Structure 1
């Protein structure tokens, strides 16, 4: 007949009141025949089914329009409840006066906007003006506000919230808005964003590194937010909003105050959204998914809430991983000091700046696959432009002849065919049955020649050696030390999509910015790490002590292998096994300046040219030459020494290497004259005491798991980062960077 209590058992509202006033005969406080429940604080009367029935007035027309729009654009059931929550419920804003921040209800006729939300204060009516007395900020908040903070409140919310006008929507066209936390009432009848930022997978998309499914929660997120196990849509909307905001301005720290005006949804529920967005924000900051890169955070205010646990970290080694970890922890507000052995930062990033017109890396200078790459993000932050490698790369023979591209492509096809047979071969072989990749390739080759009856020319044979020498460059070893089973172990995980680029200005630009304003001690080689006390005791070569609650080790694989730091307690037999299972690959580089760009008429502006080895024994000797000025004005070539070639250049001094390179170029350019170079460097990484390598690879008998094992923290106090520590992205500045962010994440939690 008529009731004064809600329809739902155990509902906490003693006196339901109708939030709509659609009906001529709306039961304001009194008895409807049925009180429909939206949430604990939100109810409407059976008369305000002015909307539902065909016979009833300025309801049915509005409702039916919404209903058609709802049905086609989204996949949620249309109902009067859904209508009320999408179309009718009042909005709630917080006061923007910083000292106040109180939640207030708006009168039904108001549509919330980011303009309103940025500027609202306790008092003001349908017009923006600050009131006069600032006394409205003293009034207590409507009692329903406090309830929304309890977890039982979300239990009693009959429909999940759907966000309006999410900055994330342009990026999410392929999805049903409601599947992704946004309102099917899409009125939006993205440019400017960096082409390299593609945060979201398009539906049913295969592995592309660092993409998030916008419609599914990852297990990491579930552990932290167990309440979204059944219905993740509220969580997903907020994370997606966060990602979209961060990538639309990655130059500034993303804060809750920045996020809130972009959260538009009617009802008391907006209060749970604004509370959750802050919790999600801190989670994603700690994980390094947001508020990261070369982001400098100012004096007083840091990226995570003040904790008072007095936690401190010593970080060993100031390369990319050390610096990534150091920067993150610092930004968090954790005390960090960095001990570095060398008289400079950067480790395997080292950029020569003395060549007029260019920066040439002694170490890293390329970015393989920019899409979602943090290196791309940091470039955007620093406003620097990378150069994308063109496809053209002619293979010049000794004598001057240019190898027809059809040979090139064919021998590459054959080389790959060989590698495919290896991946079939390995299918069932255990670790203990592994075989050098070099051995296996030859075997398969020798068989392939024997079965087919194919005869290759001398030149084809030589080009096949060129392609083999690239694999060796990639590994940093002659293939005879590389595992057939797990050489490309990491290619099972999603890899970095998009452009391969020359980081023209240098990785040093990113490195120096990461370091800026941190406590870095140079000329401080660590000799001993003692973690048996309440504090970690870190002792330097010349005897200086440093102490901290936690320590992070980022020293190169070559140096864990040699055990140059003494750990007490020792590292576990398991860990040593892992460490010794990986190889410390090596390449060297040479740079040459010339008085003019002698190669221009022959090379015609391509980023690089290749050098066909005259035999198997000369395989990695200046295999490739690089034009270090994509603007084609300055005169600097760069070349690499890989594989067996490294070993042969070991008895030669810098001048003798230079003479060998010159002789090599003059063969490649026989038909013409090549000038003497005027400035050069030859790189000696393998003998650089505190580095002794270029990048890790997996040796015969080894497993991609060794990276995971090296990364495992010890008693939650000794942590490991570094290139040889990142199973997904093994060799790169990128993987190094990400490993340092990974360990900071671990540390910041406890």
Structure 2
């Protein structure tokens, strides 16, 4: 840079492009008669640092009277119709003319190799190729010096055009996009729950990935693709397509390489990258997950993610998820569970005749891309889709006219809309309870326009209100007007809502196969003061490890059953208290026959229009628990103020109320006695004491995030109440565990 005023002695570079490192640009395409081979040309053309072509081969295709113009102009037409990106002699050489490169099969060699001008590269070739194919010892011939060049840092920046894969496995799924925008060349069956790519311009599908844009986390891990995401996108999309093509078996770099097909040396960069990005996606849980296991000497991450030690508190969905993930990564993992069984708020009763009923979760709310859907695939497990019909039954007997509900649903929704319009102005400090805000708005839509409602119309309204109480997990006077539906504005899991007939506990028992799980051992103290962390069970037993993951229910953090040393942030404590620990309660009844068949008519559920507003949560809905319509088990939900009105009376007293209600719903017929039954008491299961979280009034959705933030890279949190995007659910919990495993493994 200094002493270069003199044109006379400035440096002479043979390639015009600034920063090329080839001092002797040879030509790769003896395509004209007067190819300048290694000799002189008026201009060199830069493709990569080890790939150039001379001015005569440029003209041989670009000029009208020359005899390449045919082949090139045929290409140029297809390109502009099938692609968004501009067609140039440069792009043409890259797409059409560059020789293909291939690695040797035998473990000794593994040398890269140029192929001949006519050999077209295919997966079978790459899968098997050894040195010399269409005697001697080819496997000693020196590797081309250009090959060592590509794994060098700066080499990709000197590539002039992004690589576009050919015949990508991801090409079916991506047909709605211009191939260039997706990293495939312009010149060219699975599971229905698995739609993994957004279609152009579509939004609001959970867990869908944009095929043509890098996510933010992807950009932070691979900053080298800020300039041009194309190579990354193509490789990432390919990896996805491969995994949803077969998810019962671990996707390795070896299965990916045969499908990376590009002209040029770029292919060497591509098979090098594919390994790094496949490992990034295995950490984040994008692939090689669910209930896949491995087991035993073979792991899912390079040995340098090993010799970290983790202790996980809680054997619930979130805990177990994190544990499968870590154990599959090759990390050393111990789970301590308080109770005498794994599963947590997942606990399936199998003692019923021919049916399994969940005391805990049993429903899947949106199957498209749901981890639970995936896991049902790997396990060969069928899940039943709910039907639309659900007529609401008055006591005693008459099925409410659909046009009544259809109009009471309008008004109920219109009330929420006025609430949500009133929010826009209010801060956290001005939050009021949702139920108070509803009641008020109602009373002055009545006192306003004198249009008053029938007694039934009023009861049907209460039925809708009852549903919110089930959704929120508490009486509406506790839930935030400002944030009750905070999570609905993020993308939601599309698709079927389904009953999980075998019950969540089969996917939880499988998650937990062959893991170090200590039961009957509740944690009492977590000391992260020293170098590693020191956890102590109530009885005295000490456990130590490098990092710790707590997956404990929100209610147990709120009433500090774990001593933190140092103690938790004040900002973290306000968040933990910002949320409400919701309850509902379940009752399941086994009858000698399906007494409801004549009235209900094979529907999946039926509704119970509540007599007084006071009792709106007392058996609001009954669920047919055999989709085969063969057995007779009904299950029902106790929500809102009804949950409190039942904490005092014993099981057989709540049974009797439910039977009173069923006898009133079927007034004009007989109903038999239950043979078998249960009533859940989650409220008072010492080690859970809740059902799911919600935003207490005064809170905000942001609290889930604060609870999720780790402490000093040593203490991590997962669980249903750490997941702001997907709260409450078994799938939301599972995800959070996978999320923290990703963090820990890093």
1:50 Cα offset (Å):
5.8
- Compute the RMSD of aligned alpha carbons: 1.8
How has the CA–CA distance of structure 1 residues 683 and 5 changed in structure 2, closer, same or farther, with 3 Å as cutoff?
same
Corresponding residue SS for 1:589:
strand
Equivalent pair of 2:62/2:72 in contact (CA under 8 Å)? no
Corresponding residue SS for 1:217:
coil
1:558 Cα offset (Å):
0.7
Cα deviation digits, residues 89-109 of structure 1 (max 9, x gap): 001111222443221111110
1:11 Cα offset (Å):
2.0
1:61 maps to 2:70: yes
How has the CA–CA distance of structure 1 residues 99 and 353 changed in structure 2, closer, same or farther, with 3 Å as cutoff?
farther
How has the CA–CA distance of structure 1 residues 584 and 308 changed in structure 2, closer, same or farther, with 3 Å as cutoff?
closer
Cα deviation digits, residues 645-679 of structure 1 (max 9, x gap): 10011111111111111111111011111111111
Equivalent pair of 1:551/1:717 in contact (CA under 8 Å)? yes
Cα distance in 1 for partners of 2:180, 2:362 equals 44
Equivalence for 1:189: none
Cα distance in 1 for partners of 2:136, 2:280 equals 35
1:398 Cα offset (Å):
1.0
1:478 Cα offset (Å):
0.6
Equivalent pair of 1:50/1:58 in contact (CA under 8 Å)? no
TM value normalised by structure 1: 0.96
Matched ranges for 1:349-428 at <5 A: 349-428=346-425
How has the CA–CA distance of structure 1 residues 456 and 112 changed in structure 2, closer, same or farther, with 3 Å as cutoff?
same
Equivalence for 2:652: 655
Cα distance in 2 for partners of 1:721, 1:645 equals 30
Equivalent pair of 1:349/1:364 in contact (CA under 8 Å)? yes
1:7 Cα offset (Å):
3.3
1:27 Cα offset (Å):
2.5
1:301 Cα offset (Å):
1.8
1:13 Cα offset (Å):
1.9
1:56 Cα offset (Å):
4.4
Shifted more, 388-397 versus 240-249: the winner is 240-249
Cα deviation digits, residues 63-97 of structure 1 (max 9, x gap): 11100000110011111111111011001111222
Cα distance in 1 for partners of 2:287, 2:451 equals 55
1:139 Cα offset (Å):
3.4
Corresponding residue SS for 1:58:
coil
Corresponding residue SS for 1:592:
strand
1:308 Cα offset (Å):
7.0
1:602 Cα offset (Å):
0.8
Corresponding residue SS for 2:716:
strand
Corresponding residue SS for 1:639:
strand
Equivalent pair of 2:305/2:745 in contact (CA under 8 Å)? no
How has the CA–CA distance of structure 1 residues 308 and 442 changed in structure 2, closer, same or farther, with 3 Å as cutoff?
closer
TM value normalised by structure 2: 0.97
1:355 Cα offset (Å):
1.3
How has the CA–CA distance of structure 1 residues 249 and 134 changed in structure 2, closer, same or farther, with 3 Å as cutoff?
farther
Equivalence for 2:155: 153
Matched ranges for 1:110-129 at <5 A: 110-124=119-133
Equivalent pair of 1:4/1:16 in contact (CA under 8 Å)? no
Cα distance in 2 for partners of 1:49, 1:5 equals 17
Equivalent pair of 1:3/1:33 in contact (CA under 8 Å)? no
Equivalent pair of 1:435/1:700 in contact (CA under 8 Å)? yes
Cα deviation digits, residues 619-647 of structure 1 (max 9, x gap): 11111000111111111111110111100
1:245 Cα offset (Å):
1.2
Cα distance in 2 for partners of 1:50, 1:115 equals 36
1:33 Cα offset (Å):
3.0
Cα deviation digits, residues 321-371 of structure 1 (max 9, x gap): 000110111111110000001111110000111112111110000011111
Cα distance in 1 for partners of 2:537, 2:295 equals 31
1:55 Cα offset (Å):
4.6
1:207 Cα offset (Å):
2.1
1:309 Cα offset (Å):
6.1
Equivalent pair of 2:290/2:374 in contact (CA under 8 Å)? yes
Equivalent pair of 1:4/1:15 in contact (CA under 8 Å)? no
Cα distance in 2 for partners of 1:278, 1:573 equals 43
1:573 Cα offset (Å):
1.4
Corresponding residue SS for 2:468:
helix
How has the CA–CA distance of structure 1 residues 426 and 25 changed in structure 2, closer, same or farther, with 3 Å as cutoff?
same
1:167 Cα offset (Å):
1.2
Equivalent pair of 2:381/2:502 in contact (CA under 8 Å)? yes
Equivalent pair of 1:74/1:177 in contact (CA under 8 Å)? yes
Cα distance in 2 for partners of 1:456, 1:156 equals 75
Question: What is the aligned counterpart of 2:734 among 732, 737, 741?
Answer: 737
1:5 Cα offset (Å):
3.2
Corresponding residue SS for 2:544:
strand
Equivalent pair of 1:50/1:56 in contact (CA under 8 Å)? no
1:53 Cα offset (Å):
4.1
Cα distance in 2 for partners of 1:507, 1:598 equals 28
1:134 Cα offset (Å):
9.2
1:31 Cα offset (Å):
2.4
Cα deviation digits, residues 173-217 of structure 1 (max 9, x gap): 22211111110112xxxxx21111121112222222112111111
1:30 Cα offset (Å):
2.2
1:58 Cα offset (Å):
4.1
Equivalence for 1:185: 187
Equivalent pair of 1:3/1:35 in contact (CA under 8 Å)? no
Equivalent pair of 2:306/2:332 in contact (CA under 8 Å)? no
Matched ranges for 1:711-726 at <5 A: 711-726=708-723
Cα distance in 1 for partners of 2:408, 2:140 equals 79
Cα distance in 2 for partners of 1:22, 1:357 equals 75
Structure 2 unaligned spans of 5+: 1-9
1:172 Cα offset (Å):
1.5
1:23 Cα offset (Å):
1.9
1:150 Cα offset (Å):
1.2
Equivalent pair of 1:51/1:62 in contact (CA under 8 Å)? no
Cα deviation digits, residues 513-555 of structure 1 (max 9, x gap): 1101111111111111111011111111111110000110001
How has the CA–CA distance of structure 1 residues 649 and 719 changed in structure 2, closer, same or farther, with 3 Å as cutoff?
same
1:4 Cα offset (Å):
10
Corresponding residue SS for 2:99:
coil
1:133 Cα offset (Å):
7.5
Corresponding residue SS for 2:125:
helix
Corresponding residue SS for 1:478:
coil
Corresponding residue SS for 1:266:
coil
How has the CA–CA distance of structure 1 residues 134 and 320 changed in structure 2, closer, same or farther, with 3 Å as cutoff?
farther
Shifted more, 467-476 versus 41-50: the winner is 41-50
